[PDB]
Symmetry: C2
Subunit: 409 residues, 2 copies
């Protein structure tokens, strides 16, 4: 995946957008751009609105100003994106015809959705036992395991949707940059993974603090709080609310407090194991390939669609992989998640990835593992023997908050 | 502010008010603000605010609330970065502690009236018989932002009835590399699009 980041950063055309004008700067020293054209597209949340194609004629180290046609007016709510690509019409000694050599994307106009959600003539019915909160709307059921505080099961019709309950996730299946040169028989305290292990990030347990279920005028509101503790110390506090509305959508709100004296958590998100295994993963966000908070710039915002296999990046040494950032919508099987998040969908649990030493020893688990991160620490990479995650990619803000809408589809 | 959503629900031990507003200008939505108020049985009001900023719109100067309190009190007591005026990109001198200043000293008499007196990193604010808790920046004064904006000289300001209180979840840096070309560094610009903050307002 990372190779595409290199390709992007090292491209020979720089682009600067000002209004309707794209300034293209050549970084060629000797050759004039005599086999290139600029293809451009405007899209509204993944929908193509306009496009064009301009012969790109730039002298070595020179500039060309390309003014775009009056760009479409954002029909409805959403964000317009402008994408440009320098394509090489003719094949060369080292490239196929149609080779894309450079690209860049920008945000244009954005319309905020002031549209009110449609009213529904139905209010999820809340049944309360001592074991659970059982919410029923139409053919959908949600079961919150009242002893744990987590959404334990969901039914569609009669099919159980979860294998593992929806829980908070703070750890990462250590990357090579997290491990560095620390070893079982020779520990390097500074390595992130050592700090996390020492802090008990991989051992912290969720103590259910708060647990309530309330009926709203048109919804059910579940509120919980957990203390993630280790050796008597609270590491994380997580307060979550679930709002089941009459359209069958579950709005999840998560607030996290991180103990300031505790090594910054690897991630802040949720995860569960879906019973459903589906073929394709369809999503709106930065892609198509794996991209991380500090390795985003090559990724393009669009509607992507990949067979599930391609969500997993077969690194020889199993570790956390496949994160996709800036996702506004995720479609999988009969589930849709909306909001603004990073996600990682796979057949291996973080635990399995952490334990396994070689790629070929991994075993696809039953169902599908899905991680949805509100926040995620950068991966670093200045060197793999001394913590190289820049401060602005460390989850150091103390208080975190994110929202997620989980509906069928 | 166009009122979009407006509901009031009774919880098992609280009242939950939920509203949404669209801040619009010439047909364009600039901000969407969704707020919830939870009045609990101890008399504390938990306020949650979610803001969406149109990405194509110059980054808002601040993101907060304000009101005008009827009460004028003598001292302002608070837990946060102080004691003197400090801003997102001018914090490092300020010390975190329990501070206490006569209200007059919250106002910084700049000869050319402008926004002044912000205190950042505040976890608790006590004024009169009101207590705000959370994590915010605040600006308490006798002049409205409007009056400050309009007035050309310090000596022309008129202390207004009551007390103006601004509570910011977020606030743009003040800059200062030069005063003739926008010098606010990117990381101090409110450019994240989605914002969220919480505030507890109880008596005391």
């Amino acid at each position: 995946p990372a190779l595409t980041e290199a390709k992007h950063q090292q491209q020979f055309f720089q682009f600067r957008l000002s209004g309707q004008t794209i300034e293209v700067t050549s970084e060629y020293l000797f050759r004039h751009s005599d086999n290139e054209l600029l293809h451009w597209m405007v899209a509204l949340d993944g929908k193509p609105l306009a496009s064009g194609e301009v012969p790109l004629d730039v002298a070595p180290q020179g500039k060309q100003l390309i003014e775009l046609p009056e760009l479409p007016q954002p029909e409805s709510a959403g964000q317009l994106w402008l994408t440009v690509r320098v394509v090489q019409p003719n094949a060369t000694a080292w490239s196929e015809a149609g080779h894309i050599s450079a690209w860049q994307q920008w945000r244009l106009a954005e319309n905020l959705s002031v549209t009110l959600p449609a009213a529904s003539h139905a209010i999820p019915h809340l049944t309360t036992s001592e074991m659970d909160f059982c919410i029923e709307l139409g053919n959908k059921r949600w079961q919150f395991n009242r002893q744990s505080g987590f959404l334990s099961q969901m039914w569609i019709g009669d099919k159980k949707q979860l294998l593992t309950p929806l829980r908070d996730q703070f750890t990462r299946a250590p990357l090579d940059n997290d491990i560095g040169v620390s070893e079982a028989t020779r520990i390097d305290p500074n390595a992130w993974v050592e700090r996390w292990k020492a802090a008990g990030h991989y051992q912290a347990e969720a103590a259910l603090l708060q647990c309530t279920a309330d009926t709203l005028a048109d919804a059910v509101l579940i509120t919980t709080a957990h203390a993630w503790q280790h050796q008597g110390k609270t590491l994380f506090i997580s307060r979550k609310t679930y709002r089941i509305d009459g359209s069958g959508q579950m709005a999840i709100t998560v607030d996290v407090e991180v103990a300031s004296d505790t090594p910054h958590p690897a991630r802040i998100g949720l995860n569960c194991q879906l019973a459903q295994v589906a073929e394709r993963v369809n999503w709106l966000g930065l892609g198509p390939q794996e991209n991380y908070p500090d390795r985003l710039t090559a990724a393009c915002f669009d509607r992507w669609d990949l067979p599930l296999s391609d969500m997993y990046t077969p690194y020889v040494f199993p570790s956390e992989n496949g994160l996709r950032c800036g996702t506004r919508e995720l479609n999988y099987g009969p589930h849709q998640w909306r909001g603004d998040f990073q996600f990682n969908i796979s057949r291996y649990s973080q635990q399995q990835l952490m334990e396994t030493s070689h790629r070929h020893l991994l075993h696809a688990e039953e169902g599908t593992w899905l991680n949805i991160d509100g926040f995620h620490m950068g991966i670093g990479g200045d060197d793999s023997w001394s913590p190289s995650v820049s401060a602005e990619f460390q989850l150091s803000a103390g208080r975190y908050h994110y929202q997620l809408v989980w509906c069928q589809k």
